[PDB]
Amino acid sequence: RSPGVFFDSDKGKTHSSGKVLYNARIIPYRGSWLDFEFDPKDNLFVRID
Amino acid sequence: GQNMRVAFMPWNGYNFEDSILVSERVVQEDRFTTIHIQELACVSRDTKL
């Protein structure tokens, strides 16, 4: 997977809601990953690696 | 490999599933003959004995 930013969906299977989801993922060529993801409550979250 | 004269026809069950019937000519002409070179090593080590 080429280093850069990548925006995904992950729709259907999450929590049945049909509300889908949206997540951004910043992948470097070296070092830690930076993730930003949503959730059923429409709150924005962040996880390192 | 080597192209050769081939006939499509059942021969006494000898070709049964995927199997192949080869003329004695092919083995006589030494055409499908293959040469292999094996490397066999002998080790002289040291033991307490």
């Binding site: - | 026809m9 059942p10 006494n12 069950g13 070709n15 599933e17 199997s19 080790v43 080590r45």
Partner: protein, 1345 residues
């Protein structure tokens, strides 16, 4: 006589907790030092992990120091260093021990899922670990004081409590504390108190959680174990040879990680022992104790605390738990396989010169295999001086040893096996025939059974050494002894490819050829006519034949006549033996009829004639197939001339729908469907074009102009005979191939027009690619899935084996044809044959017994039942078998590689699982009668309308077509409100209209007649006013009770039938009046005051599959959207709906207590709101839950559900599996049952139906008059049913090893064997088959005097 002391052949096993003394018993010494060897002259350092004194001598029969080196010295212990001089094998035996400084918890019993110490003490795990780590104090036997027993304290709290009461109170911390807790515990008194408590408070949860624990407790008491032993005092050390230090080339050594772990444990323990003598401060000694606990834990089971790493290597060291568990999922030693001597393997090939009982065995291979036999056979005759000389002889390959090998090879069979073994046919015994070459020659007729191709598949050979193994291989595993599939009685030896093409080309007929019309005296001069090039193979000829029949009693009758046949068929008749009628070979003989020939030959003549017949058939098949000169050219595939037109028209069609999309006449989603439909419809045209242009295409002439017959075209002969290829496959070569689909899963609207014969442009190929890739991946995955299913199935069955002979029960199931949809998706003679009757069936005229009581139904019996019109036979089944812990022969059936009834001791569960799992790789609006018969209405209440028609008032209604014979052909279901033009006992013809209705409408009709009144219908509340704008005819639409107003939501709208007087017309024959309420979104028909009659609708209301399906079935998985059933028979009602859901109030006409359930209203209903429904009726449609079937319908219903569903899956793929196997899987599934009443065992305990029945049946007499307890059958999935096993050794295999071993240990489980898997693990004769006798005899010697 003295019982015994020393080692005889042992019975069963016992597992339990080990006392410190019991541990010291095994120990032949203590290991006091971490040292291993001497580091220079490598020798065990005394009192080390490796020691000669503690364990054993490094060399056989020699002392360590070297004092006594002679084999004479045995029981002598050396004086310098005590080592008894004995074989070094004892270094694999002798245990050892370690005296621990401070007590140490056994991690298995501490960290187990229930946490055995914890629930024994009724103490939470967190608190126990808190104590062990010296985090907090815990009181023990607090006596009469301020504090309780199990109560935990802290530093300050313990100090203060100590300042108050010095004595009469006790508290400790660490492992010693838990040890004290366990030791002080009185099981008896605690039990008594629990018994007093169980009887006071009446509550489900309380008494359940109480009774479970008291059960566990008394179990622990009777176990013989003791709580103290959960805390380790002495630590056993494993024999050194099981953790070898053995050296390697280059001087480097290698050893087990158990050495590292053990060494750590010893080191830390010694350090603790030193620190105690040094009087170190608490902060130190505590740390050392914790380190000791950590080390010991890491030794026993690593990964439950720190995951300790081995020296110089990152990878975590492998502990004893990991030694027992092994790896590769759940496998422990002999399950996952093992290496075997006297064996080999190689590439496989042809050899049709072979006979069905033999196989080509390479000279060199056979030599190296039977090499030990050759050795003895050489010096037996005196050809060799001694064994060494024999070895030298076969090593020199002296010319004599070949002829000497031919002796040992003669009657000594060999086992041939393939890689993907599924069904028992995967391993078959043959007779060795010496062959020059390195390749193994296999008989062609077996290639079907092995599923082995000639494309470079390899097979393995095994030598049956012991006499018993030879006779087992010859009388059981022999090739000729199995001619039949274990799945179904059909022949597995059926000719495959070239042979069937040969017999096809023989028995085929041509319109005009040499010898047409001429007559022949017999087969001899027929073959003589053909072989001379005089008469053609296929030509119409009358010949004199002599056909026999065995129709006399036990006797062959001879008859002779002139049959009209072909020359080829007549030549073929020279083969077919004895009683078989000439009509068998008189046909074209496709792959089907050629099989039924062999079948009938087996069911008439016998085994031997069938075998020799089969061999002859293969021989002549290959022969004439060779003679046939059949080939495949490029001109053999004929493309339809009209194809190019069919495309164009279709290519026009899409264009139409392409324009309408631009003009907005059609929507996008509609356009897509239109285009895909027309394009897919074109393919059928091209395909059924090429077929007609193929099959009959040959147009020939006989003494005249033209006559056409079946084509002699090669590829077509192949496809039609069954040699290879099929319609779908030839379709891809000639006609267009399919319409591919993008990875999205959606189908592309531009199908592939070109075929394989034609070129393929870039695109088309690129599009075919995804199909190819996904195909390969799919198959590769389905292999694994099939394997797993097979595994689960073998696990759930296994030990089930025929034990008794005849249990003698009239119980069974009702066997009728499946009668699915239009006609008979499977006949009666199939589901019947091979299965012994439960009770004597009768002719249509009664008092006549054709088949008495229980008799195995074979071909003749089933034929007799076929003479008569009988549509049903009651059959004994494995699921209904009264035999406990097994199955009687008279229940199971006959079917096997032989036609005879099932033997005694054969293991049926295994072959059942195999038979189900082997084929599993292949897996993925008005009634109009198709035939002529008489109408029969089953289970229906209806009424006659004012139109003279017949309207059905029943939801569950069946329509059967019973012809003049009295047999049921057609079967359908007729919905409520359907209009029948006929009645029960009527007459219809083929295609005649019987039932009619509408899908989108659920008409609510009226049985009685009169005016229509209106009650509880108020506008704006219950109903609403809507008038059609295209007509002006209206109805007041019933407003659903979700959307209604404030107070109008509480009223139930209805249509009540009134007569001329204004009274209420009652439901016929009852006190109860007739008022039909209406549901939500239900539009009416006629308004108030308007008169109606019967049949007039009061209001009209609007509206997976494959292998994983089988998996879901056998696992009894509840579906996603289950059909709800009526729990209790009665009249349904709708209470006031609540909370987004709807109440459903059932009203029993019989007793009492009207039951109400919560059904979400969004789910579309089924049941009439104002009518009665029996238990098991459908309140809504959709998939049915198996548990619901078992509970609301019954065992016989649910077993039928399973078998019919799984067979619906398999039969759809064209796969034959006898219902038997599935029935045994079912038997294993419902094995468990949960008790209801009491008087012997516990209340809610789940327990085996066999166990429970064997108890209550014993309690129906003697005992108490009957104190016997009621139960309820329970449906368990195959994996959950497999989870239950008496043998802990068997359970240690497929389940989680740790948990099983622990739970079994604390209980003191005694494994009596008696099962298959556990006996295999321990390496003794299987309690079935050959061994069944042995284990039977012993079983009788046991539990007796």
């Amino acid at each position: 006589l003295k019982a015994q002391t020393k080692t005889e052949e042992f019975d069963a096993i016992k597992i339990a907790l080990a006392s410190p003394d019991m541990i010291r018993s095994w120990s032949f010494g203590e290991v006091k030092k971490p040292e291993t060897i001497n580091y220079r002259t490598f020798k065990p350092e005394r009192d080390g992990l490796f020691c000669a004194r503690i364990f054993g001598p490094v060399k056989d029969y020699e002392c360590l120091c070297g004092k006594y080196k002679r084999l004479k010295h045995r029981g002598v212990i050396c004086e310098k260093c005590g080592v008894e001089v004995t074989q070094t094998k004892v270094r694999r035996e002798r245990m050892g021990h370690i005296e621990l400084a401070s007590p140490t918890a056994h991690i298995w019993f501490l960290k187990s899922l229930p946490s055995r110490i914890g629930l024994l003490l009724d103490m939470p795990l967190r608190d126990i670990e808190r104590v062990l780590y010296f985090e907090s104090y815990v009181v023990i036997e607090g006596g009469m004081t301020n504090l309780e027993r199990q109560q935990i304290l802290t530093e300050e709290q313990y100090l203060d409590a100590l300042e108050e009461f010095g004595d009469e109170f006790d508290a400790k911390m660490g492992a010693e504390a838990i040890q004290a807790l366990l030791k002080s515990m009185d099981l008896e008194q605690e039990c008594e108190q629990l018994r007093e408590e169980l009887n006071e408070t009446n509550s489900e949860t309380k008494r359940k959680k109480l009774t479970k624990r008291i059960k566990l407790l008394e179990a622990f008491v009777q176990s013989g174990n003791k709580p103290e032993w959960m805390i380790l005092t002495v630590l056993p050390v494993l024999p050194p040879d099981l953790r070898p230090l053995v050296p390697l080339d280059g001087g480097r050594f290698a050893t087990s990680d158990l050495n590292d772990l053990y060494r750590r444990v010893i080191n830390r323990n010694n350090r603790l022992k030193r620190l105690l003598d040094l009087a170190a401060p608490d902060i130190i000694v505590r740390n050392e104790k914790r380190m000791l606990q950590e080390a010991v834990d890491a030794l026993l089971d690593n990964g439950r605390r720190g995951r300790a790493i081995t020296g110089s290597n990152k990878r975590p060291l492998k502990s004893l738990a990991d030694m027992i568990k092994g790896k590769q999922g759940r496998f422990r030693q002999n399950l996952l396989g093992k290496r075997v001597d006297y064996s080999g393997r190689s590439v496989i090939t042809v050899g049709p010169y072979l006979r069905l009982h033999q196989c080509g065995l390479p000279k060199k291979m056979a030599l190296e295999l039977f090499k030990p036999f050759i050795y003895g056979k050489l010096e037996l005759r005196g050809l060799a001086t001694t064994i060494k000389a024999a070895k030298k002889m076969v090593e020199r390959e002296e010319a004599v040893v070949w002829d000497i090998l031919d002796e040992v090879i003669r009657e000594h069979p060999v086992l041939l096996n393939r890689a993907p073994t599924l069904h028992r046919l995967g391993i078959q015994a043959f007779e060795p025939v010496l062959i020059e070459g390195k390749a193994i020659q296999l008989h062609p007729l077996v290639c079907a059974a092995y599923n082995a191709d000639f494309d470079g598949d390899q097979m393995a050979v095994h030598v049956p050494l012991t006499l018993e193994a030879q006779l087992e291989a010859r009388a059981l595993m022999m090739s000729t002894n199995n001619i039949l599939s274990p799945a179904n009685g059909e022949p597995i030896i059926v000719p495959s490819q070239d042979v069937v093409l040969g017999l096809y080309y023989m028995t085929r007929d041509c319109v005009n050829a040499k010898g047409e019309g001429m007559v022949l005296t017999g087969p001899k001069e027929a073959e003589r006519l053909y072989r001379s090039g005089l008469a053609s193979l296929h030509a119409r000829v009358k010949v004199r034949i002599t056909e026999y029949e065995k129709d006399a009693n036990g006797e062959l009758v001879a008859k002779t006549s002139l049959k009209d046949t072909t020359v080829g068929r007549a030549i073929l008749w020279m083969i077919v033996p004895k009683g078989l009628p000439y009509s068998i070979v008189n046909q074209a003989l496709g792959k089907k009829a050629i099989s039924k020939m062999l079948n009938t030959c087996y069911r008439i003549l016998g085994l031997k004639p069938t075998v020799i017949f089969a061999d002859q058939i293969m021989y002549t098949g290959f022969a004439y197939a060779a003679r046939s000169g059949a080939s495949v050219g490029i001109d053999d595939m004929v493309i339809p001339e009209k194809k190019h037109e069919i495309i164009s028209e279709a290519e026009a069609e899409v264009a139409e729908i392409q324009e309408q999309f631009q003009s907005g006449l059609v929507t996008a989603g509609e356009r897509y469907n239109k285009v895909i439909d027309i394009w897919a419809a074109a393919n059928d045209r091209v395909s059924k074009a090429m077929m007609d242009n193929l099959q009959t295409e040959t147009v020939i002439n006989r003494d005249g102009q033209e006559e056409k017959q079946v084509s002699f075209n090669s590829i077509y002969m192949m496809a039609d005979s069954g040699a290879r290829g099929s319609a779908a496959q030839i379709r891809q070569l000639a006609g267009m191939r399919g319409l591919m689909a993008k990875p999205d899963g959606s189908i592309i609207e531009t199908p592939i027009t070109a075929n394989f014969r034609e070129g393929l442009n870039v695109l088309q190929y690129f599009i075919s690619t995804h199909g190819a890739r996904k195909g390969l991946a799919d198959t590769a995955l389905k292999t694994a899935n099939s394997g797993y299913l097979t595994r689960r199935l073998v696990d759930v069955a296994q030990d089930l084996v025929v034990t008794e002979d005849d249990c003698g029960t009239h119980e069974g199931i009702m066997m009728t044809p499946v009668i699915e949809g239009g006609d008979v998706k499977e006949p009666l003679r199939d589901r019947v044959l091979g299965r012994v009757t439960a009770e004597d069936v009768l002719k249509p005229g009664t008092a006549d017994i054709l088949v008495p009581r229980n008799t195995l139904l074979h071909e003749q019996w089933c034929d007799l039942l076929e003479e008569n019109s009988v549509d049903a036979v009651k059959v004994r089944s494995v699921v209904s078998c009264d035999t406990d812990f097994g199955v009687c022969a008279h229940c199971y059936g006959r079917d096997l590689a032989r036609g005879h009834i099932i033997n005694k001791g054969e293991a049926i569960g295994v072959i059942a699982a195999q038979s189900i799992g082997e084929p599993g790789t292949q897996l993925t609006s008005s009634i109009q009668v198709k035939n002529k018969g008489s109408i029969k209405l089953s289970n229906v209440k209806s009424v006659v309308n004012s139109s003279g028609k017949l309207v059905i008032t029943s939801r569950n209604t069946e329509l059967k077509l019973i012809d003049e014979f009295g047999r049921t052909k057609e079967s359908y279901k007729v919905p409520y409100g359907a209009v029948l033009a006929k009645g029960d006992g009527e007459q219809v013809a083929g295609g005649e209209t019987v039932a009619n209705w509408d899908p989108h409408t659920m008409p609510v009709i009226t049985e009685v007649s009169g005016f229509v009144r209106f009650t509880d219908m108020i506008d704006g509340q219950t109903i609403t006013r809507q008038t059609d704008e295209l007509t002006g005819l209206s109805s007041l639409v019933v407003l659903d009770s979700a959307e209604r107003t404030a107070g109008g939501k509480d009223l139930r709208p209805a249509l009540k039938i009134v007569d001329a007087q204004g009274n209420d017309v009652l439901i016929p024959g009852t006190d109860m009046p007739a008022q039909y309420f209406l549901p939500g979104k239900a539009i009416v028909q006629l308004e108030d005051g308007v008169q109606i009659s019967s049949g007039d609708t009061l209001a009209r209301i609007p509206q997976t599959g494959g292998l994983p399906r089988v998996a879901d079935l056998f696992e009894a998985r509840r579906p996603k959207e289950p059909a709800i059933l009526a729990e209790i028979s009665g009249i349904v009602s709708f209470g006031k709906e609540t909370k987004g859901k709807r109440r459903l109030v059932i009203t029993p006409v019989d007793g009492s207590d009207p039951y109400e359930e919560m059904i979400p209203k969004w789910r579309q209903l089924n049941v009439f709101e104002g009518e009665r429904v029996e238990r098991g009726d459908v309140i809504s449609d959709g998939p049915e839950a198996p548990h619901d079937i078992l509970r609301l319908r019954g065992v016989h219903a649910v077993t039928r559900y399973i078998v019919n569903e799984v067979q619906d899956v398999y039969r759809l793929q064209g796969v034959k599996i006898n219902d038997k196997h599935i029935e045994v899987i079912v038997r294993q599934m419902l094995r468990k049952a949960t008790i209801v009443n009491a008087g012997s065992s516990d209340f809610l305990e789940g327990e085996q139906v066999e166990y429970s029945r064997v108890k209550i049946a014993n309690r129906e007499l003697e005992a108490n008059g009957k104190v016997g307890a009621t139960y309820s059958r329970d449906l368990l999935g195959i994996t959950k049913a497999s989870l239950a096993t008496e043998s802990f050794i068997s359970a240690a295999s497929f389940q989680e090893t740790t948990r099983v071993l622990t739970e079994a240990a604390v209980a003191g489980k005694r494994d009596e064997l008696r099962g298959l898997k556990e006996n295999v693990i321990v390496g003794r004769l299987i309690p079935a088959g050959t061994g069944y006798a042995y284990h039977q005899d012993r079983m009788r010697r046991r539990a007796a005097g």
